[model samples]
Structure formats: C-alpha cells, structure tokens
Target: DAFITNQLRGAQNQSSGLTTRYEQMSKIDNLLADKSSSLSGSLQSFFTSLQTLVSNAEDPAARQALIGKAEGLVNQFKTTDQYLRDQDKQVNIAIGSSVAQINNYAKQIANLNDQISRMTNDLLDQRDQLVSELNKIVGVEVSVQDGGTYNLTMANGYTLVQGSTARQLAAVPSSADPTRTTVAYVDEAAGNIEIPEKLLNTGSLGGLLTFRSQDLDQTRNTLGQLALAFADAFNAQHTKGYDADGNKGKDFFSIGSPVVYSNSNNADKTVSLTAKVVDSTKVQATDYKIVFDGTDWQVTRTADNTTFTATKDADGKLEIDGLKVTVGTGAQKNDSFLLKPVSNAIVDMNVKVTNEAEIAMASESKLSDNRNGQALLDLQNSNVVGGNKTFNDAYATLVSDVGNKTSTLKTSSTTQANVVKQLYKQQQS
Candidate 1:
C-alpha cells in the first residue's frame, strides 16, 4: 500500500509539470499572435496613410469653399480650348485675305512691268504710286535697273519684285516653283533685276499677324497648361474617394497631352499660382513726413533715419517713400494709387501718376496699366486697396478643409488601435 501511494504522488508531480509546460506553450503562442496582429495593423495603417496622401496630392483645393471651382475651371478651360480652334479659323481668314491683297497688288505691278517692257517707256509716276502702295503695307527699298525694270527690296532684303530678260514674268506662281515669287519680266532677253519684298505695317492684316504671333497664341497656350495642371491634381483626389454613387475611377480632368507651343512645341504653358499678394489693404500710418534732397528722391519717417527716396512728379505731386510710381494721364475711372503714407499707414491716392497722358492717349493706349490705378478703383468702392486678400486666407482655408477630414479619421483609427492593443496586452499578461 505504501509503494502504491508513493507511485501515485510521483505521477501527480509529473502531471503538474506537464500542465505547467502546456500552459507556458499556450502563453507563448498567444504572445506571438498578438505581436503579429499588432505589426500587421501598423503596416495596414501606414499603407492607408500613404493612400490618403496620394489621393490628396492629386487634387489640391485652395479652400473647401472652392471645392466646386474645378468645374468652373474646367469649363473655362474648355472655352479656351474652343478659342484655340477659333485662332485656327482666324489664321485661315488672315492667310486668305493676305493672299488676295497680294494678288491684286501683284496684278497691278505686273501690268506696270509689261508697260515698261513692251512700250519701252519709263512710267516714273506709275512706279512711284506702286512703291508708295507697297510701302503703306510694309517698308520697302527700291532700285531702278536698266531696261525700265524696277527692283523692289523687302525688309529682309529679299528680291520680291524682280525681272528677268529670258521670259515675261507674271505675279502668279511659276509652273516650276509653287510658292509664288514676286518678280516678273517681259521676256528672256531682259536681265534679272533684284526687287525687295515690301514690308506690310499699318493695315489690319499686319496687326492681326502681330497679335496672333506675339500675344494670342502665347496666352492661349498658357491657359491650356493651367487647365491641365489643375485637372490632374483634382482627379487624383477624386479617384481615392468615391462619388455620390460610390463608384471609383480616375479624375475628371484628363492629362493626355501636354500643352505646347507651335513654334517651340515644348513650352510648359501651364499657369500656376506663382505668388499671391495677400493683405493688399494692410495699412501703414497715414501721417508721414518727407525731406527732399536736390538730386535724389528721399523720405524720412518720424525724424528717424527711416530714409528712403521720395517719388515725385515734375508738378511736385508727392509719391510714397522709396516706392516706384507709375503715373496715369487723366482722371479716368481706373486711375488711382495705393500710397504707403507712413511705415504702417497705407492710404489710397486717387490722383493719377500721369493723368493728362491717359486722356491724350486714351484712343491709342490703355491708361489703367499701373498699381496706382487699381488701388484707386478699389478704394472708391470701399473695398480693400488692391482687392487682394492675404495668402494666409487661402492657406488657412485649405488646411482646415484637409485637417478636419484627417482628424476625424485619425480619431477613429486611434480608438480601434487602442482597443486592439489592450486586448493584446491582456492576453500576454
């Protein structure tokens, strides 16, 4: 009986050891699982954050209020796109009109050349009229050759109106060469005379070409680029979030091709907010004193060495200290100025920098081209001088928009993570 009891006690000790071992193994497995789950959750959260960032970067809004701005922007861009098409139309119209005009002038000049050749008579009066007509279109240098032939030279010194003795030249394109040459001769016997192409300057055709090449084309290309940039950014954000229907797709803005110039073909025509002048109304003190040096423009504020050049007109109109002044010519609706009266006092000055010039040149020049003009108009309306709010306004609005959404999501994510972490700790313990 004593032996049996001892054996039973030994068995009990072994069983207790086995139970403890099993419990320890279970605890280790639980701890490993908890660690793995936590690491996975963290990784998942990291991925989520990355996705969110990508989404937001795709479409940045200046403010929540401007959320619908993309639609309007897109519409404006479409209008600009249509305008580009219109430019092509304008180009076609111009090319046709210019060719017609050239043909008419060419016919008259060709007739004159024939008269000089066949009649063998020099019509100096007719020649002068032709020269004057061409000059009105564009500048031309003229030279008379032997055999009553006229040599007309263009701005680039091209032999546009020329004659050859071998064949009677016509203003129309020759059978051999398609791009019409301006020269014509009575016959092959006549020697070649160099005539310059006349410069066309004053007419509507000239103006149209100038505007198209210099401003219209460039401005159109820039607008297109601006549209694409905004579209790309906004679409990226739209993709990350669902629409009203809970559907997912790329952004509405398409970026298939980059905006380019016809000449260079690679100008990044996009317009971005390069800089914003916020707080255009921020004021300096109204009362400021200035002392003038004979040769230099100088101003001193409050007897302190706050020295600056005083801007003034010949008529002694006082300008702001150290500021460049652009004067308008007249008392026009748009004539005005923003005056920094003192260090802290910003006042709107209504007097034009050059008011007389504006009135005199109003028919030809745009007078409201300076900062002073803008300030004057804004001040009159009791709006902020310059009508530009500060950069802080837009930035703050953007932050608030993104921040609110981010904050709510973060809060939810944190609560979930905390619960999971507590569960893990309890299990480990």
Candidate 2:
C-alpha cells in the first residue's frame, strides 16, 4: 500500500545535514590552528623585546625593536579578527541560502500534496521523496490521516503542512542584532512569525545557526577580551614611564570602546546607552542585558541569566565587572539595551606608539631608568585577563575550546553519517 511505502521510507536522511556542519568546523579548526601558532610565536618575540627594553632603557635600538614586535602582535590580532568576521558574513549568507532552499522544498511538497490527495504508487513515492528532502533541511514529522491526507509538523509541534498546504519559512534579520539572520515561519493570517533558533534544531539550517551562536560568536568575543585586556595592561604600565623627551608616556596601544544597542522593540527611541571599559582585567567575554522594569534597571548576564539590580556610583555611571555604562535620558518602561564590552576590540585595536621614543622606558625624568619598564615584563605573568587568567593562559583556553568543539563535531558527523547509511540499507533490504 502507499501507506506502507511511506512508513518504510522513514529515517534514511535524518543526519545528512550534520556532515555539512562538520565540513565548516573543519575549516575553522585548520584556520584557528595556524593563527594560534603564529600568535604564540609573536607573543614570545614581543616579550623578548620587552626584556631588551628593561635591560637597557636608554638603548634606542631596543626601543625600536620593541615597537616592531608590538606591530607584529597587532597585525596577528587584526588578521585573526578579520578571519572571524569573514566566517560570520559567510554564515549569514549560508543561513539565507538554506532558507531559500527550504522554501523551494515547501513549494514542491505542497504541489505534490495537491496531486497526491487527488496518486497511485508513483505519486506516493514522489511525495515521500520530497518530504525526506525537506527533512534534511529542517526535521519534520509526517502523519497520515484516515482520508489519506498528510500532515507535517516541526519538532516543536508547529504545523508546516496539513492536507494540501505547506508553509514557507522566511529568513529575516534578527531584531536583537540586525546583522544576524533568523528563521521565521510565514503564517497566512498572522503574517511572518519568527521561529526561535532553539525550535529549529537538527538540520543543516539548524547546524548553521548553532555554529554561529554557540561557536563563532563566542570565539570572537573571547578573542576580543584577550586583546582588550592585554592592551589595557600594557598601556597602563607604559603610562607610568616617560618618553625620551622627558614627557609622560601616551598609551602604547589603542582599542575601541564598548558597544551598546537598544532593542529594536524598545519603547523609547530616545533612550540610549554608552558603555566604556573602566578596568579591562575584570571584563568578561559575553553579552549583558539591561531591562528597565519601570522602577529599577535590572542587569543580567546573557550567558548565565544571572540577574541583579544595577547600581550607579557617585559618577552616575553603572559600574559592573570592569565596565561602566551611562544611560541617556528619556526613560521609558520596558526599555532594554544589549551591551557588548569587548566583542569587537580585537579588530579595532591598533598600535598607538608612533616612534621608538614613545616606547616609554623611563620612570624618572631622565631616560636612564628600568623599574618602569619592569612592570611591562611582570604583566606577562599577571592574572590581568578577567582577573583569573594571564593573556597567554586565556588565549590557550580559547584555542583549546575551539579545537575540542571541532573534534566533537567531527566525531558526531561521522557517527551520524554511518547511522543514516545503515537505515538506508535496512529499508532497501
């Protein structure tokens, strides 16, 4: 019977999408490995240059060498950061392409359902084939009715198709971050309804979203955190010393300020937020949410959902962790803001030291001092990154995390592919 044919064809393509995810992650693993090793070498050479500076504060040669090493580190950070950005843009494009492919499947399935309701074995097989292909895009459940009508539902119990109707999925810009694309269900009556990424889990579409939110985004933030902390530590120490002209030192490195965005759905357009890093050592590589409950502003860590009432210091700036946020006027109930402390710092960071003299190797007015330069060496081993790890330690953890995630994806994809093949063979038998 046609019903029997449908039942026998189940589960043969459930995991095909995971293989695509594995391929993307494999590229990331290779790219990160190359960059991580290069960064390690640059860091070592930069530290050696600092050592040279501390030994002979008056040596113009050593100061020039240190400036060159600093430039090398800066270039490494810029390249790695730009690579992540390239991945992000490609991920967005993939998401859009996947949504387009999904819609094509929906249209085909709906056309097939129209004819299936009105075929014999050939029609049934065609409809079943289309359903399987659709499942590879976004997993779905199929149920046959008493009168031969087929109903399709997502894992979240949202109806995709019923009888002869199939719903199209839309790729919409996320309200939280317009730069990101989100999947939405096109409802005839209610217009386009946004589908939460969590609900769209288990297919190539799901895999792309997961990679961005879980792996790519976090990796970028962690990298930015290290860049900001390292720059801050170096700049702070360098500021304590004087240049060759007996002038107080300027910051050797410069990084961008924190970024804050008001929610697209926020009540008050006039209300805005600006945040700055007060002490980069305590800054965490994650996003924070500020929600106004009409009376008090509540701050919550987006990673952990740890909520607390925000308090302002005497300066009227809300200080938390290592950053301070200044809220604009025109308060409105339910206004929410998203804050990213160091998310883009790696790409924005640059070496600000213009010449060898700006390397700042002296504590006293004279150019023949060493204690001030010694602080730069001490910062290498200090726990200045998030107050718990040194720059090197933090970077090592970031590299290891990506490697571990890539390894797990590789294994899962292989196992899933095997399972899919076995199911196909069993059905054939």
Candidate 3:
C-alpha cells in the first residue's frame, strides 16, 4: 500500500507540473495572437488614411488632415515595430534562461545516473520529467546506456550529456549581426563552438528564433520598402510639378539612405560601398551580398538564390534589379559587402512638405494645370510595390498573411496543450 501510494503521489506531482507548463505555453500563444491582430489593424488604418487623402487632394483641410494621419500612421508603425522588437529581445533572454535551465537539468541527470546503477522507478520518473522539461525548451535526443544512465544529444547531434559530465549551452551575441543572438556549446577543453541557426528547428526556443528571423524581420523589411517607395515616387512626381505658390515643388517626403556593411575579413578593408534605389517599383525588401570574384563583381540576393553580374558604367555606378551600387576602387578579389536598400528607410521617413501651400496640385508650371492631383491619385493603384502589387494590395496581403499565421499558431498551441494533457493522463494511469 505504501509503495503504490508513493507512486501515485509522484505521478500526481508530475501531472501538476506538466499542466502548469501547458498553461504557460497557452498564455504565450494568446499574447502573440493579440499582438499580431493589432499590427494588422494598424496597417489597414494607415492605408485607409492614405486613400482618404487621395480622394481629397484639392482640399487644404483634407491635405492637412492627411499630414496628421501620416504622422499618426508613422507612430503606429513605430509602436508596433517596437513591440515586435521587444518580443525579440525577450526571446533572446528566454533562450539564455532556457539554456541555463537545460544545463542544470543535465547536471542533475548526470548525478542521478552516477548514483543509480539500475533504473529505479522513482529515479527514472524524476530523470524523465527533467528531460521532458528540457525538450520543451530545445529539441533533444535521448538514448539509454548500459548502466541505465541516458545519453543526451541536441537535435544537431551535439552531445550534451555523457555518463557523468554535462556539456553547457550558452547564448552568444552574433559577431556578424550585432542585433542577433546565437547558441553555442561551452567546452572546458575544446572552447566555445557556435551552433548553426538551421540546426534548431523544434521546441519553444526554435519557435521563437524562427518567428524572429522569418516573420518579424520580414515584416520590418517590407514596411521599410513601402516607406522608401512611397517617399521616392511621391518626391519625384512632386518635384516635377508646380505648387499653389507658383514655385517649383520640392521633395514631398524624406527617407533615409540604404545601410551598408562590409565583412570584417574582406581582403580590401579600404573598400566602401554606397547604395540607392534606382526603381522603387522594382525594389525588393532584401539584403544583397556584393562579392568580387577574381574576374568580376557579383551581387547575390540573400532572400533568394538569384545572382547578377555587376558592371560599373561610365558614371561609376553598378545598377542591378533596381538598386545602384557604387564600389570604391580599392575593392579586392573575394571582398564582400552587405547592402540593405530599404530595411531602415521607415526609421527616418518624414513628410518634408509641411506647408499646405507646397502640396503640388499642378502638373505644369502654370496654375491652370490640375493634372498633378489626378496623377497623385493614380499612385494609389499604381504598380509601385514590387513591380506587381499596388500599395493597397501589398499592405492587404501583409495583413492577411499575419492574420493567417496568428490563427495557425493559436490552433497549434491548443493542439499541443491537448497532447500534453493526454500524455499526463497516460503517465498517471
């Protein structure tokens, strides 16, 4: 009776612990879903404001309202983006915590193995519970040993725990991208070895990393592309027209320049790269890697496997896929630089023409030309986003995609919780 009661008590405690974990997972899922929905709403509101401004181009009050809406929209984007960024930081912190927890679990498991020559039910239950918790944080593989101690390995086949020694995992800041963090193994004799991001493809840590890299980064890049394209196209058309005061229209909007960084190990440290958008409609929200092979320079789109040979023209600018890259003379063979044409554009975007009188409504220098207003309206439906999708279409698609992802995540979380409940019930039985 005593043995059976002890076993029952142990099973009950395990079930309670697992239930708490499932609850925590559900909470995270709901929080993400709520945030995603808000982001989608903000995007829709911004576009609606743009549409309203397009409809009332001739009205001064309407133009002023448009400016107000533009500022509000920018604020919304900044707020939502900041929230997403905070989530990323939180994920990184969580990853570090998870790694520490995993190390502790591994150490305890190793100790348990040393004390137990044979698998006792109580010892096995405790070890399995620790292993299960570790699996929730990061994917791991387990194998039984001769002495009943389990060998633990990561999803990438890196041994984490061997018989009596536990290997530790550390969260390290990426050398190439300062804003990013990566996982590595800390070895006392062999030193620290970094793990590839691709090797992490399961568990909560994997889910967090995947969301940050694939979803959050893509959303930010797309937002930047929209800001850049809208500013450039609007400014170009505005400069070509006349304002209400009969003066040549100035740039209507301002956007930041593309960000460029060279690899630290480049052969030519003196080389510099400058990038600009040549065609807004054709511009993509992707980074490009410019490399100088011994014979010629080549640009590779990091988002896809597309490669283009780069040749500088007489003007000393190399244009490819709507981006112009100016290379310095000191560039050497195998030297590489990273180019981000639109990723940071939104951060510095602003309405330069604050004066309502400066809103260009005339296509020609004469006041009688009202064609510019219609031309501005045409921009709404124009193929200015990715050379295929219009501004509205592009934003709509983004919202839809986010909504779908949120829904899928919610469903997945619920399913995972259900599975956890069933497993606990079986263990208790």
- How far is each candidate from the true structure, as Cα RMSD in Å? 38.0, 2.5, 5.8
Clashing pairs in 3: none
**Model 1 segments more than 4 A misplaced:** 1-73, 117-126, 163-206, 242-249, 259-429
Clashes of each: 49, 0, 0
Give the per-residue lDDT of model 2 (tens digit) for 1-429: 544444433333335556766777776678778854557678888998899888988888998999999999999888888888899899889888988887787777777778876652887778778778877778778887776777778877767777777777788887667677888887678877778788876677777877787777778888888889999999999899888888898899988778988877787666789998989899988888888788778898865668889888888788877988998577687888889888879767889997887777778777367778888898989999999998889878887888888898888888877776765666676
Model 3 root mean square deviation, Cα atoms = 5.8
Reference-based lDDT, each prediction: 0.35, 0.80, 0.69
lDDT of 2 at 423: 59
Put down candidate 1 lDDT per residue, 1-429, tens digits, no spaces.
Answer: 434423333333233323322332232233223433322233233233333333332222211212233234334335434544465455445545554554455556656766777667247567556655554343345566787676655544545466431122233332212222333333346543422222333233343433443333333333332332223333433344432222342344443231111111112212111111122233222222232233443444422336566555575444442232332232222111222222111111111111112111011122112222222212222422212322223222323433443344345445544554554454445
Q: What is the lDDT of residue 173 in candidate 1?
A: 32
The worst-scoring run of ten residues by lDDT in candidate 2 lies at 5-14
Q: Count clashing pairs, candidate 1.
A: 49
**Can you give the lDDT of residue 339 in candidate 1?**
25
Ranking by TM-score: 2, 3, 1
Candidate 2 segments whose C-alpha is farther than 4 A from its true place? 1-17, 35-37
For model 1, the local distance difference test gives 0.35
